[PDB]
Amino acid sequence: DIISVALKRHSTKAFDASKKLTAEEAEKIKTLLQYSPSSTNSQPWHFIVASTEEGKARVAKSAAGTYVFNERKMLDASHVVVFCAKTAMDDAWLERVVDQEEADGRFNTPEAKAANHKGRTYFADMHRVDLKDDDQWMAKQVYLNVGNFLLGVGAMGLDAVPIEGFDAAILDEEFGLKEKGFTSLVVVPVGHHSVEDFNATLPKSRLPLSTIVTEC
Amino acid sequence: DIISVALKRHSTKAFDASKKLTAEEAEKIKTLLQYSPSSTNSQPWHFIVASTEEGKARVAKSAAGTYVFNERKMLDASHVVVFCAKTAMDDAWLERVVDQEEADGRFNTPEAKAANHKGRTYFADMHRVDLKDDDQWMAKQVYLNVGNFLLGVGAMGLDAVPIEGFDAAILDEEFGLKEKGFTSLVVVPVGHHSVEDFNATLPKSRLPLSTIVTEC
Numbered sequence: 001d002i003i004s005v006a007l008k009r010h011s012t013k014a015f016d017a018s019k020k021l022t023a024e025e026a027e028k029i030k031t032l033l034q035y036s037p038s039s040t041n042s043q044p045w046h047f048i049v050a051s052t053e054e055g056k057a058r059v060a061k062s063a064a065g066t067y068v069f070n071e072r073k074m075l076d077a078s079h080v081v082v083f084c085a086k087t088a089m090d091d092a093w094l095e096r097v098v099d100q101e102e103a104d105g106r107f108n109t110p111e112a113k114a115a116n117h118k119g120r121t122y123f124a125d126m127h128r129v130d131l132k133d134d135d136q137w138m139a140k141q142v143y144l145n146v147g148n149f150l151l152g153v154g155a156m157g158l159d160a161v162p163i164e165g166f167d168a169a170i171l172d173e174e175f176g177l178k179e180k181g182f183t184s185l186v187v188v189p190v191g192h193h194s195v196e197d198f199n200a201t202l203p204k205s206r207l208p209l210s211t212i213v214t215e216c
Numbered sequence: 217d218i219i220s221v222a223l224k225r226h227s228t229k230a231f232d233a234s235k236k237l238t239a240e241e242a243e244k245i246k247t248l249l250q251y252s253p254s255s256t257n258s259q260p261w262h263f264i265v266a267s268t269e270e271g272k273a274r275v276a277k278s279a280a281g282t283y284v285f286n287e288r289k290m291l292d293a294s295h296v297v298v299f300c301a302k303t304a305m306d307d308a309w310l311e312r313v314v315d316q317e318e319a320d321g322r323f324n325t326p327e328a329k330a331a332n333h334k335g336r337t338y339f340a341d342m343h344r345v346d347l348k349d350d351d352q353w354m355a356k357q358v359y360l361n362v363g364n365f366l367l368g369v370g371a372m373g374l375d376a377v378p379i380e381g382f383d384a385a386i387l388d389e390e391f392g393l394k395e396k397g398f399t400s401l402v403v404v405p406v407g408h409h410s411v412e413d414f415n416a417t418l419p420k421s422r423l424p425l426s427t428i429v430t431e432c
């Protein structure tokens with residue numbers, strides 16, 4: 001009942017620092033990150049998975065000052081995932097993706113690999129050259145991954161919260177992401193809620209279907 | 217198991233037009249679109265759900281010509297969902313969201329509404345005034361919804377494919393989206409794959425964890 005999951009999951013506001021993911025749950029949440037779809041299977045992303053106390057403290061440095069309300073969440077969760085996008089799409093990455101597809105057996109003929117390569121490069125160059133928005137295009141693929149991830153961990157029975165309330169410049173510098181060609185977009189602490197998670201008992205709220213949906 | 221769903225779902229390349237969603241599935245997918253999370257619960261989206269022959273043909277107009285390889289997906293699927301983002305974030309929309317949250321009982325005191333209203337608007341003007349990218353910020357919330365949606369319909373046993381290969385200017389004009397304040401971002405046909413779906417029997421391909429994940 002994935003609809004029941006969607007109506008029961010929520011953004012956790014406080015995590016129990018004594019409750020850790022199992023070894024199997026930790027493997028599964030990385031599978032979720034890995035197997036998210038993306039346009040042209042571009043996978044323009046990298047993920048920092050912080051589970052040690054020092055690692056999470058490094059992530060939490062980005063939630064200082066104006067974002068202090070998000071700091072404890074990053075310190076208290078079991079596993080803290082930093083979602084990162086590539087800052088520029090390059091031909092080396094397009095080759096890495098198509099060569100991984102080739103090794104995985106997705107091309108039955110050389111014609112199929114050449115068409116998959118040409119099609120992906122044509123669409124990536126539309127963003128790289130024509131629209132000059134490949135950084136935005138790739139970041140959108142990362143947000144799609146986040147949405148897949150939040151529903152996935154909810155269906156696993158894990159608590160989580162997506163966070164944009166952090167200083168991405170501080171987080172990027174903390175993990176040297178700019179020199180690697182990545183930038184942090186969303187931080188998602190994952191674990192089990194604590195008694196201070198006031199959002200666990202509040203009702204959900206969405207705009208009504210009469211507003212957001214047009215049936216045609 | 218939701219990890220089984222993630223490992224088994226695929227982008228459907230051909231649909232069986234005779235396999236419709238059930239009435240119950242058609243109601244579930246609307247709740248699935250509605251209850252996706254979004255930054256500050258901004259819900260900056262609208263969805264066209266085309267299920268009639270005329271409606272699906274109208275959406276398919278956006279795939280004529282250069283994007284013709286996506287046209288039959290839009291025509292043959294049971295239901296076709298058009299994900300749209302608001303073109304600009306306005307104060308009236310933010311008040312609509314907070315009014316809905318209050319009506320649903322999320323605020324215990326008046327000091328809980330205003331701190332929520334000003335917390336949403338302080339972060340809203342971060343993209344409206346400072347970073348001048350609220351259109352991009354809203355689009356990213358819509359992509360997050362798409363990711364929630366593809367895992368969701370996959371958990372329901374339904375087939376789907378997310379489509380960026382369409383002409384948004386044609387789709388926007390066909391549904392008058394600009395005048396309503398929205399623009400089309402992703403088309404997702406939903407239904408059941410046919411035997412012509414060559415991607416149903418291809419192995420999935422993802423970059424390895426040693427590339428995309430840094431544990432700390």
Ligand SMILES: Nc1ncnc2c1ncn2[C@@H]1O[C@H](COP(=O)(O)OP(=O)(O)OC[C@H]2O[C@@H]([n+]3cccc(C(=O)O)c3)[C@H](O)[C@@H]2O)[C@@H](O)[C@H]1O
Binds near residue numbers: 112285380
């Ligand atoms: N792995 C594979 N192994 C074997 N054949 C493969 C194949 N991938 C495609 N094909 C071949 O492709 C043909 C149909 O192409 P199909 O996969 O439906 O679609 P495709 O040609 O890749 O894309 C259709 C349109 O959407 C655009 N677009 C935009 C964004 C993302 C993507 C995307 O694909 O992620 C595409 C693209 O620029 C183009 O204008 C078939 O004849 C099939 O044989």
Ligand SMILES: Nc1ncnc2c1ncn2[C@@H]1O[C@H](COP(=O)(O)OP(=O)(O)OC[C@H]2O[C@@H]([n+]3cccc(C(=O)O)c3)[C@H](O)[C@@H]2O)[C@@H](O)[C@H]1O
Binds near residue numbers: 013067202328339
């Ligand atoms: N519905 C509610 N009913 C009762 N109390 C409610 C409440 N909502 C917040 N509160 C109160 O707020 C406090 C906890 O704050 P908390 O919810 O953790 O956090 P919040 O105030 O929503 O935001 C924390 C930081 O993240 C930033 N941010 C950025 C982007 C998106 C979002 C977002 O929220 O989507 C936030 C925001 O600008 C701020 O710097 C407690 O004092 C709690 O009582």
Ligand SMILES: Cc1cc2nc3c(=O)[nH]c(=O)nc-3n(C[C@H](O)[C@H](O)[C@H](O)COP(=O)(O)O)c2cc1C
Binds near residue numbers: 013255
């Ligand atoms: C991209 C994104 C960023 C968010 N940022 C924050 C945040 O910084 N801190 C926070 O406590 N909640 C944050 N939220 C949680 C939203 O307020 C929440 O998703 C929304 O109110 C809907 O509630 P729900 O997640 O319980 O269904 C964010 C959500 C998203 C999707």
Ligand SMILES: Cc1cc2nc3c(=O)[nH]c(=O)nc-3n(C[C@H](O)[C@H](O)[C@H](O)COP(=O)(O)O)c2cc1C
Binds near residue numbers: 036041380
């Ligand atoms: C935003 C987005 C746009 C996509 N556009 C297309 C498209 O236009 N036509 C298509 O057939 N597939 C499209 N795809 C499918 C991707 O090729 C597919 O998600 C990726 O190769 C991973 O495979 P999977 O979805 O089977 O796991 C798109 C996927 C995403 C997420």
